[PDB]
Structure 1
Amino acid sequence: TDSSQGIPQLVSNISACQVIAEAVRTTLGPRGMDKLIVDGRGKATISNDGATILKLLDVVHPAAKTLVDIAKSQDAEVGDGTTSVTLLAAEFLKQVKPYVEEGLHPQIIIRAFRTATQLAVNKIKEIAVTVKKADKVEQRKLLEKCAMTALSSKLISQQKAFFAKMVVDAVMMLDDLLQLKMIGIKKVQGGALEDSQLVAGVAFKKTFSYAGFEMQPKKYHNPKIALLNVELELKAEKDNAEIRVHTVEDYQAIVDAEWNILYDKLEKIHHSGAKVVLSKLPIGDVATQYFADRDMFCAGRVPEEDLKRTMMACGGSIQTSVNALSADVLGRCQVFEETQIGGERYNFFTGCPKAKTCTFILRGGAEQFMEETERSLHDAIMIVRRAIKNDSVVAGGGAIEMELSKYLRDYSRTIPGKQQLLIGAYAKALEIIPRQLCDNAGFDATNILNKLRARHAQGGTWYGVDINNEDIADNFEAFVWEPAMVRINALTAASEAACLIVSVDETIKNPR
C-alpha cells in the first residue's frame, strides 16, 4: 500500500521508461552493441528490435510498464514502430524532467503534447503520397521498391532487388494481414543465392528419414494429409510384453498383438482417408515399419509452423491423434512432392483446396546472406504488406522528423508560456530518432541534423538523413518508403504515451 508523491516519483518514472529506450536507441538500423541476454531461466534472449527484449523485461513500475505496453500497443500492429514510440514518449518524459524542476506540473502538462501532435499529422497527410497498381508501379513494383526499400536498406545484394519482386509474390497471394502468419518463409541451405523460391502453399523444409522412408512415397498429386500434432514411434505403442511358456508359440504373439496396434493406429487414419501423414513429432522404427508397410506417406518431427499453416493451406486440421479422425481433418493438396533441397527433405504442398498459406522460399546456398534478408523479409513484409494496406506512403529517416521539428521549432515562437518548452522538446524528439541513424550513417547527428534543418530551410520535401544511403536528402526519393499511416499511429503514441504518467506524480502500489 505504497506511494511516492510529487515530482520525486514523477521524475523517477522517466528513467525506468528511458533506460529501455537507451537500448533501442538505434535498434532499427541495428548497429550498436548487442549483448546476448540470459535471464534467470537460463534463457539466452535477444531481439531483431526493441520489443522482444521489452517483452522479456518486466517492471513493478506502472510507468515503465506503460510505454512498454504502448510500444507493444504500437508493436503488434505494424510489427514495428516500437523503438520509435519507445524513444519518443520517453524522450518527451526525458526532456520534461528539467522542465519538471522548473515545473511543467500544472496540467499545462498534458496539453501541448497532443495539441502539437496533431500539427504533425496535419502535416503528415498533407505531405502524404499515395501509391497504386497503375500509378508509378504495379504496386508490385512498389512492393518491389518498398522491398528494395525494406530489404536493401540494411547491404545484402541485388537479390534484394530480385527478392523485391519475389517476396511480393506470396504477399500478393496472401495479402490481407500486415504480417506473414499465413505466408511464412522457408530457409533453404543449399542451392544458391540467385535462386530463391516461392510455393503457393506450405513447403516443408525437411521431413525425416526412417526405415522404409525411401520405400515410402515422396510424391503425391493427391495428398490427403493427416496433420499430426502427435508422434507415432516404437515408444508410442510398446512392443514390450511377455507371456507364459510351456510352449514357445506365444513368443511371436504377445509382441505381435501390440505390433498390430502400432500398425492399426497409423493404419486407421491410413485406412479411413489418409495417404499423407504429417506428424510434427517423432516416428520410430516399428511404427514407421507400418508406415513403410502402408506406403502412404509418413512424416514426423516436421515443423508445425508449416504443419499448422498446412492446415491453413490445405483445409484439413491439426490432428491431436492418429485416430478418431475423419478424412476431412486430413490436409489436402494437389501436390505432395518431396524433392530434397540440400539436406532438407523438401515437401511441395500446393494445389490446396484453399491454400491460405503461400510461402516464400528463400534459398541461399549459404547461411549468412539469407538470415540477413530473412530479417529484411520481415522488413519487406512489415512494409510491403503495409505498403498495400496504407497506399499513402510517408518517408522515414528524418524525412518529416526533421521537417516536422523544423516547423515545430518554428511553432515555438507562437507558443510562449510554459509549454513552449514542450514545443522544443516535442520538436527535437522527431529529430532524436535520426540522431542515431546519423551515427548508423556514420554521421554526426547534430551538424547533419542542423544541415537537415537548413536543408529544410532550403528543401523540406522529403529531405532527411538516411542511413539507407548514409546521406542527407529526400527520403521518399531516396527510396525510404513506409506508409504515412504508421506515423499518425506512432504520433498518436508519441505525445500521448508520455502524457499518461506525467499526469501522475502520485503513484500508489499495493501488495494485493
Structure 2
Amino acid sequence: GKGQIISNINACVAVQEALKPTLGPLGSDILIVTSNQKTTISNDGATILKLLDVVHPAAKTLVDISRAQDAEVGDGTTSVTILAGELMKEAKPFLEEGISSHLIMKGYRKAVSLAVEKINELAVDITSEKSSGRELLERCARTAMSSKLIHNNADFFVKMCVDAVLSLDRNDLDDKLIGIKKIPGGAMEESLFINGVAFKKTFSYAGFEQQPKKFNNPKILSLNVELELKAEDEWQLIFEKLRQVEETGANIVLSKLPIGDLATQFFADRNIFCAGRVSADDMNRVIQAVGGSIQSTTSDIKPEHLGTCALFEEMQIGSERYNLFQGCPQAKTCTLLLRGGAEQVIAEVERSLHDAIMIVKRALQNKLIVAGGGATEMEVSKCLRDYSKTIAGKQQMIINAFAKALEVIPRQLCENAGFDAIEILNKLRLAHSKGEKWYGVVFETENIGDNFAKFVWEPALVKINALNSATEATNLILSVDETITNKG
C-alpha cells in the first residue's frame, strides 16, 4: 500500500545524505572500501554509486540515471541524485494528509513544463547585438585574464585566443592541436594570428633571399627526406629526384631534416620554396591542414597529394623572416605566434593564455548557456510560486513544494564551501526579487554578486537533462506500492 512508498523515501535520503557533501568542486569525498579490500577515492558520484551496487530498486534507479548523466553529458551526476532525492522529501508529508500519489506525480510534471520554458528565457543568446564568434567569447576571457600585467594590452590578446578554436571544426575541439611558439623581439600587442602552421627559420647557410615569398597558385607536396646532395644509409641521381618535384609543379617542400644547398639553387629558377629541420609535430599538422598525404619517394607521388591555399607570404615578424600559412579555411588546426621583448616574458604570458582557451572551449561546444551561481535556480523557484495562482487547488501545494526542493542545490554548495546556508538564502532572494534578477552568490567570499559580471557560466543542457531525469525517476518510485524481491 502507501506504506511502501515511505520506506522508499528513506532509501533515497540515505543515498542522498551521503552524496550531499559531494556536491561542488570543493565538496567532501566519499571513501568506500569494497569487499575486495581495494580502497578508492573518487569525487564524481558515478564511480561512487557504481561501487555500492545497492540491491534496493529505488536507490538503484538513482544509480542508473547517474550513469546516463555522466555518459551522454558528463556533468551533473551528483546534482541529479540530490535533486531527485530532495523531491522525495517534499512529497513525504503529502501522503499523511490523504493526497494520492498520482496527482503528486502529475503535479511535478506540470512544474517541469513551466520550468523548462523559463530556462530558454533565462539563457543568453545574442542576435541583434551586432556581434560575432569572437566578441562574445573575447569578453569572457577578459575578466579571467584581468588584474594582470597584460591588462593594458588585454583587449588585443583576446582576439587570437578565440579565433584559434574558430578556425577549425566547432564540433571537435582539441587544445593540444594548437601550437604556440615564442618570437623574441617586437611589441607584445603587435602579434598576429595565423590560420595555418608556422615555424621559425632553421637555415644557417648563406644564400637566403633567393626565392620569392609570394605564390599565385602554389602546390603542397609532402616528401619525408630526400633533399641531400650527399647521403647523411650521385649528383645526377638527386637531380632526377628533384625533377619529380618539377614534373608535378610543386612549389612547397617540407622535411624533418636539413636541406642541402643543391636544392636551393635548383628551386630558385622554378620559384619553389623549401624548408628543412621541421619538427615532427609540425609535419602532421600541415598534412591535416591541406588534407593531403605524405609519399616516401619521389616516383610514387600521386596527383591528389597536392593542395593550395589562398596566399603564401613570409612575414618579417621578429626581425627575421618566418614561414606561415594564411588563408586556409580547410585547416584542421592553427598555430599561434607571440611577440615580446624577452623569451621568459612570453613564457609567462603563454601559460596565461592556455587558461583563457579552455574557458571558451567548453562554451563553443554548447551554444545554450544560462547564468549559474544560484541565479537560474532562484528564478525558477520564484516563477512557479507566482504562476501557481492559476494552479490553485491540490496542484498548487505540489508545485510550491517543488520550488522549495530546487533550493537544495545552492544549499550544499554553500555548506561545502564553508558559507552559512541560512543567511545566504535570505539575502539572495531579496536581491533577486528587487532590482536586477542576475545577482548570484560569490563562490570565493560570501557576498551578493553578479555571476554575469564575473563571466562565470554553466551549460544549460546539464540542468535540463538533470531536471527531466530527476522527475522521471521520481515518478517511477512514487508509483510503486509493493516491492517483491525473489531470492537467487
- Taking a change above 3 Å as real, the CA distance of residues 114 and 479 of structure 1, as seen in their structure-2 partners, is farther
Letter in 1 for 2:374: G
TM superposition score normalised by structure 2:
0.61
Aligned to 2:275: 297
Kept after mapping to 1: 8 A contact 2:382/2:403: no
Kept after mapping to 2: 8 A contact 1:90/1:498: yes
Aligned to 1:226: 221
Letter in 1 for 2:143: S
Kept after mapping to 2: 8 A contact 1:216/1:292: no
What are the Cα deviations for residues 327-385 of structure 1, in whole angstroms up to 9, with x where unaligned? Answer: 5523433225376869x995310144866766665557433443333221232354478
Displacement of 1:139? 1.0
What are the Cα deviations for residues 37-84 of structure 1, in whole angstroms up to 9, with x where unaligned? Answer: xxxxxxxxxxxxx9xx9999995779767545534533xxxxxxx54x
Kept after mapping to 1: 8 A contact 2:439/2:449: yes
- Taking a change above 3 Å as real, the CA distance of residues 419 and 10 of structure 1, as seen in their structure-2 partners, is farther
Kept after mapping to 1: 8 A contact 2:175/2:358: no
- Taking a change above 3 Å as real, the CA distance of residues 55 and 409 of structure 1, as seen in their structure-2 partners, is same
| Secondary structure class of the residue paired with 2:440 | strand
| Secondary structure class of the residue paired with 2:157 | helix
Aligned to 1:139: 131
1:148 and 1:86 map into 2 onto residues whose CA distance is 30
Aligned to 2:143: 152
Displacement of 1:122? 2.2
1:220 and 1:446 map into 2 onto residues whose CA distance is 68
Aligned to 2:314: 337
What are the Cα deviations for residues 187-216 of structure 1, in whole angstroms up to 9, with x where unaligned? Answer: 343558942744352132568x58869979
1:491 to 443, 447, 463: 463
| Secondary structure class of the residue paired with 2:448 | strand
Displacement of 1:301? 0.9
Aligned to 1:3: none
Kept after mapping to 2: 8 A contact 1:174/1:183: no
2:178 and 2:49 map into 1 onto residues whose CA distance is 31
2:289 to 289, 295, 310: 310
Aligned to 1:465: 441
2:222 and 2:49 map into 1 onto residues whose CA distance is 37
Kept after mapping to 2: 8 A contact 1:225/1:330: yes
1:217 and 1:108 map into 2 onto residues whose CA distance is 84
Q: Percent identity?
A: 26
**Residue correspondence of structure 1 range 93-492 to structure 2 within 5 A:** 93=84, 95=86, 115-128=110-123, 130-132=125-127, 135=129, 138-140=130-132, 143-144=134-135, 146-153=137-144, 155=146, 157=148, 158=151, 159-167=153-161, 174=167, 177=170, 185-191=178-184, 194-195=188-189, 197-199=191-193, 201-205=195-199, 209=202, 220-222=213-215, 223-227=218-222, 231-232=224-225, 240=233, 268=244, 272-278=248-254, 283-284=256-257, 296-298=274-276, 299-303=278-282, 306-311=285-290, 316-319=291-294, 321=296, 324-333=300-309, 334-335=311-312, 337=314, 347-352=323-328, 361=337, 365-383=345-363, 394-407=370-383, 423-429=403-409, 431-432=410-411, 435=414, 439=417, 447-459=423-435, 461-466=437-442, 472-476=448-452, 478=453, 480=455, 486-487=459-460, 489-492=461-464
Cα RMSD for the two superposed structures: 5.8
TM superposition score normalised by structure 1:
0.59
2:139 and 2:261 map into 1 onto residues whose CA distance is 49
1:218 and 1:10 map into 2 onto residues whose CA distance is 77
- Taking a change above 3 Å as real, the CA distance of residues 194 and 32 of structure 1, as seen in their structure-2 partners, is farther
Displacement of 1:495? 1.4
Letter in 2 for 1:465: V
Kept after mapping to 2: 8 A contact 1:199/1:348: no
Displacement of 1:146? 4.4
